[PDB]
Amino acid sequence: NIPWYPKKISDLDKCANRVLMYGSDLDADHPGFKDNVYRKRRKYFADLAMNYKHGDPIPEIEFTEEEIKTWGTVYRELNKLYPTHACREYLKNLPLLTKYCGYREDNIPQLEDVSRFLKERTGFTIRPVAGYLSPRDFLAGLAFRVFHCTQYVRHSSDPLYTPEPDTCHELLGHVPLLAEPSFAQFSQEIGLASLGASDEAVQKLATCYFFTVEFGLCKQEGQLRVYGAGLLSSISELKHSLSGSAKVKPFDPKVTCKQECLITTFQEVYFVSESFEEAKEKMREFAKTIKRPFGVKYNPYTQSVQI
Ligand SMILES: N[C@@H](Cc1c[nH]c2ccccc12)C(=O)O
Ligand SMILES: [Fe+3]
């Protein structure tokens, strides 16, 4: 029996913010969970996300001097590593972000400005979210070219790694590729394939998504490079992935889809494709094997999904 799925872009208001939270589904010995004062600050961002309705501007945030300093460290340190660690497709759009989005060490990009930039480039827009979103709902968002983003900044004591996604993850891990027409098209295709598929089928697709677009590696002129958003936002996990001591295995959906997705620690294993194009291709073909009893298109003019 076909699970509920959104049919038009405003339907993303329905049961919004079904997110995984510390003290319910997440735990880790890390100050971003354990520092009570920091959790009280995080609730300011969460409330903003919970009251958002499609059509609203995204709330502009007054960040603390501490939060701005954290963004600065993350931005600066990651940019030193990208030239040697990131795949060329990721490197390509970095200068657009600085030139056309105001990415700077001394200022955190606002989600409203980034959404406007992305809409113009590939038609992607942003919706704010209170934490790690339910995988079904996150993939459903992509079908409308909607990327759900957190707005809080990770705990300042650990710029290197954080156990839930923060705004640095969205802005540095996802935005550069989302700015690329061919990648934005790929993203929506994966999202459309997920709509109304069984819980077991979505779990398998979402796991493969996690180990490719969140934590994926690819070969490039005989070398190992990274394209996964979750690595590209973590100073320490990014280095570790290419350190020579990480466990690395070929991406094979039928094996990979069984791996547990680790939200709050470094991964136990990373999966490699023979190239970045091969990664997208194997993902598209896997999405087609879902066994859904109907097909679906997106109509960008009505912003609705046609069966
Ligand atoms: N570890 C990531 C944030 C993160 C936590 N859990 C995740 C799951 C998927 C992608 C990213 C994440 C970072 O430090 O930037
Ligand atoms: Fe991500």
Swiss-Prot record:
Q: Which domain of life is it from?
A: Eukaryota
Residues involved in L-tryptophan binding: 132, 154, 162, 233, 263
Q: Which cofactor does it need?
A: Fe(2+)
Coiled coil: which residue ranges?
A: none
E.C. code: 1.14.16.4
Q: Name one GO cellular component term.
A: neuron projection
Q: Where does Fe cation bind?
A: 169, 174, 214
UniProt-listed GO biological process terms: aromatic amino acid metabolic process; platelet degranulation; regulation of hemostasis; serotonin biosynthetic process
Family per record: Belongs to the biopterin-dependent aromatic amino acid hydroxylase family.
**Protein name (Swiss-Prot/TrEMBL):** Tryptophan 5-hydroxylase 1
Report which part of the complete sequence is shown.
Answer: 105 to 411 of 445
